[PDB]
Amino acid sequence: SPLPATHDLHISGSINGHEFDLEGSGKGNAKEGYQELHLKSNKGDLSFSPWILVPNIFYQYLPFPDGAMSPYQAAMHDGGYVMHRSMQFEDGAMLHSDHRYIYKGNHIKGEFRLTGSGFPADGPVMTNSLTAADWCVDKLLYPNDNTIIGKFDWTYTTTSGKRYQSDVQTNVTFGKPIAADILKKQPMFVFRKVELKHTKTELNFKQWQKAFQDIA
Amino acid sequence: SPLPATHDLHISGSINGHEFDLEGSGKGNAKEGYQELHLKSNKGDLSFSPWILVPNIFYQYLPFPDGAMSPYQAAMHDGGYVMHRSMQFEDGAMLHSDHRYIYKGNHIKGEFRLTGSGFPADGPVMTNSLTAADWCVDKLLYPNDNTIIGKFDWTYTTTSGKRYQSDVQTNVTFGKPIAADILKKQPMFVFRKVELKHTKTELNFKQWQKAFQDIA
Amino acid sequence: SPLPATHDLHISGSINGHEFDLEGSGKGNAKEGYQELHLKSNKGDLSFSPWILVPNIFYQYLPFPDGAMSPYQAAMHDGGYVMHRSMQFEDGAMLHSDHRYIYKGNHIKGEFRLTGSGFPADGPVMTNSLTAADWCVDKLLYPNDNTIIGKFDWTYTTTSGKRYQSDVQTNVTFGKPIAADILKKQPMFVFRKVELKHTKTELNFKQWQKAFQDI
Amino acid sequence: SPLPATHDLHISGSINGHEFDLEGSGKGNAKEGYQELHLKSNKGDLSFSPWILVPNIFYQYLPFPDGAMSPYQAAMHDGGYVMHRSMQFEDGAMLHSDHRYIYKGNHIKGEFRLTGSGFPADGPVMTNSLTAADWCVDKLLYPNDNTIIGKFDWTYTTTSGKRYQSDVQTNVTFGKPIAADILKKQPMFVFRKVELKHTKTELNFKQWQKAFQDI
Numbered sequence A, B: 001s002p003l004p005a006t007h008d009l010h011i012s013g014s015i016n017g018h019e020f021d022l023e024g025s026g027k028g029n030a031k032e033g034y035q036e037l038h039l040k041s042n043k044g045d046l047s048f049s050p051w052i053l054v055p056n057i058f059y060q061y062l063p064f065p066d067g068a069m070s071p072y073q074a075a076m077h078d079g080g081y082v083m084h085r086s087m088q089f090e091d092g093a094m095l096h097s098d099h100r101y102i103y104k105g106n107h108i109k110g111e112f113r114l115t116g117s118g119f120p121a122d123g124p125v126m127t128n129s130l131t132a133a134d135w136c137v138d139k140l141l142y143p144n145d146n147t148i149i150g151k152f153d154w155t156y157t158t159t160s161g162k163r164y165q166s167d168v169q170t171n172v173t174f175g176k177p178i179a180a181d182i183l184k185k186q187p188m189f190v191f192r193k194v195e196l197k198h199t200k201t202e203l204n205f206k207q208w209q210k211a212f213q214d215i216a
Numbered sequence C, D: 001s002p003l004p005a006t007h008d009l010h011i012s013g014s015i016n017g018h019e020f021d022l023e024g025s026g027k028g029n030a031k032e033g034y035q036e037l038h039l040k041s042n043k044g045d046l047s048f049s050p051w052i053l054v055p056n057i058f059y060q061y062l063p064f065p066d067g068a069m070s071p072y073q074a075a076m077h078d079g080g081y082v083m084h085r086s087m088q089f090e091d092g093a094m095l096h097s098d099h100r101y102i103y104k105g106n107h108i109k110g111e112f113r114l115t116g117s118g119f120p121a122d123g124p125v126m127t128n129s130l131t132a133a134d135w136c137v138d139k140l141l142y143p144n145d146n147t148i149i150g151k152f153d154w155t156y157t158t159t160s161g162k163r164y165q166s167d168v169q170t171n172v173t174f175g176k177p178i179a180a181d182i183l184k185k186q187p188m189f190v191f192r193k194v195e196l197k198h199t200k201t202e203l204n205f206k207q208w209q210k211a212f213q214d215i
Helices: A071-075 B071-075 C069-078 D071-076
Strands: A004-014 A018-029 A032-041 A081-091 A096-106 A108-118 A130-133 A138-142 A147-158 A162-173 A187-197 A204-213 B006-015 B020-027 B036-043 B081-089 B095-106 B105-117 B132-133 B136-142 B146-160 B164-176 B188-198 B202-212 C006-015 C018-028 C034-041 C082-091 C094-104 C107-117 C132-133 C136-144 C148-159 C162-172 C188-198 C202-212 D006-015 D018-029 D034-041 D081-088 D096-104 D107-117 D130-133 D136-144 D149-158 D165-172 D188-198 D200-211
Touching: A004 A032, A018 A204, A071 A081, A071 A162, A081 B081, A081 B095, A081 B105, A096 B081, A096 B095, A108 B081, A130 A187, A138 C136, B006 B036, B020 B202, B071 B081, B071 B164, B132 B188, B136 D136, C018 C202, C069 C082, C069 C162, C082 D081, C082 D096, C082 D107, C094 D081, C094 D096, C107 D081, C132 C188, C162 D081, D006 D034, D018 D200, D071 D081, D071 D165, D130 D188
Parallel strands: A004 A108, B006 B105, C006 C107, D006 D107
Antiparallel strands: A004 A018, A018 A032, A032 A204, A081 A096, A081 A162, A096 A108, A130 A147, A138 A147, A138 A187, A147 A162, A187 A204, B006 B020, B020 B036, B036 B202, B081 B095, B081 B164, B095 B105, B132 B146, B136 B146, B136 B188, B146 B164, B188 B202, C006 C018, C018 C034, C034 C202, C082 C094, C082 C162, C094 C107, C132 C148, C136 C148, C136 C188, C148 C162, C188 C202, D006 D018, D018 D034, D034 D200, D081 D096, D081 D165, D096 D107, D130 D149, D136 D149, D136 D188, D149 D165, D188 D200
């Protein structure tokens, strides 16, 4: 049926052993790749940079080239999917997440669970020193008919001027096979840009996305 | 108070998108480093090798050298701890886990949650071809007073004769500071051996452990 | 200070302990990114897939966007640069290289040294089962004014249908500071395509390259 | 077929694009694992911490347990071996090396080539702030009869108190098959300790080593 138009998210888990829990709703344009989302904390002030919740804070808004359904869009009413992502940061920290969804017509409800640990007390996550995430190219491959293995190098700029880097791998597992015509076009890349306004208790996130097999 | 003598575990999560859930109980000797555990499935036959649940299936049974309390033993009645472990396998699979505990006198109850994804359909986890885990040396460092960052190279032998390898990092976060005299002895290593008997629904696990700063 | 038009390569080292040595020459168009190269073995038949020598077989041919010189082209007559590249393969093999260059007007001479090891005897490098390399996006960052640290995920298709993957990092070190206006545009990405035809003793290589900051 | 008693090393390459070259000699006891080595620079003051040249500054000095020859000692008069080592540092730097040897009776001559790059100008290698290397356990596996693939996590202490970490993999490739009875004992671990005293031009290095399968 339809592409999604609106979504909500409950995201919870712990960073360095401290529990956090946020929820909120947003919307987007699934032909353009754009979405935005507001979150508010249920457990008081975040003790860590809200920027570490990106990329984790909805590829059902991502089309494939020339208006084709991405595998995420096609699965939405046919079998669904989950994601499992790993971020391994340069200073020894790690952050994993599980991503699950429920659809009600053109509305997506996400339930994401995250565990992040090992962030140094004086590093840029626990001092709120991340300032922006660099624009990013995601590389996707499909090693079998129901799995995407994707990877990107993820870097934030920070207040000291040094970037903060992590290796990010995302495995996406589908309830039914991906269409043969999607499977034959590998690798697929996706260019993304994000913005985030935030306080200690609230986030306003925006993201643009565009898949490509080749450039102009 | 006492070192632990008995424990139980509920461990659940998903592998390649399929949910699993096991529970059972065991016991050990916290002066010798030895424990054993029985698990039985609540959700029918496992669709994956039970060996992939090791190392995940209790360092409160591990003493430090010369009968000293390990940081895990000392935290047990003073602040507690959690663990976050990552296994990144050579064929692109990933498995993360969160480890939490509740103590009632000398009894430990564990509640572990795992997400593993990306195991190839013909690889050794999804074909039940893992045969044993190699003996292993864990290296621990304490980058601050409440955190252990530990690492080991984890390898199983398999029915084809080829080993199956992963990089394993475990971040352990303590509710109160680790004692100064433990913090000053780094790195600490731990030698471990495990055995596992299993069926599609039940596991019988055993593990021996011995911490060392140097060898004979 | 001309852009390069032609280039030679001597590339030697070992794979799994077996010494190899190739040389040959090629040409390209430094306004368009394209280059091509022929190589011939000086030590008999190669005992491994010639495809493993890609990406290692000249970013002086890469312009930056809108007719700008890339940092590689600008260094060419002003301090030079070297590269150090690491390939870490999914099956435990590793391949490192050192890249150095000498320029004579618009001609480049490359001298590259490689050590690869730990390729399984039944894997696709030692069985010559690599069939092509996937198109690739390289992400570059400049952590200081004389260094590029670049990364890509590098995958071959193989005769079995199973891809063969490696993490690739390339650190490029310049003899003089990169221009401030290049340093401000980060990350920079580069999209590349390669072809290779080969025999046991010869390689005929082609590459297209194009830098982009956005799509 | 004597065990080694004495050794020389010529080690050269570059760190962050700056060429370096050292040579010197040492000795050790191949029944006990210990060796020591002196090196002196042929190109002026080192511009980086000499500690970064450890572990790279001779497992022919390592016996295996119970007076057994290690695979390195047995290859010494029977086909030899080379090593390829990769150090991947937590701050993005990389250091690879190629190790080759020539034997004359009980003397070893090493010729090692290294390329390190991407060390931050304010990090502890380029500020000479590494103070010691932590004691270390090396895990070895033999995926086929002529290869060792070994791994350790390598950490220095520094003057700031913050350790400096790297993933280290060493692939060793033999000219003849390793003995079946060595191949059956896997993993094998090796516990090592090092010391280094240094100046801008000289290094005085000591190492203790002991193989173990169990404790």
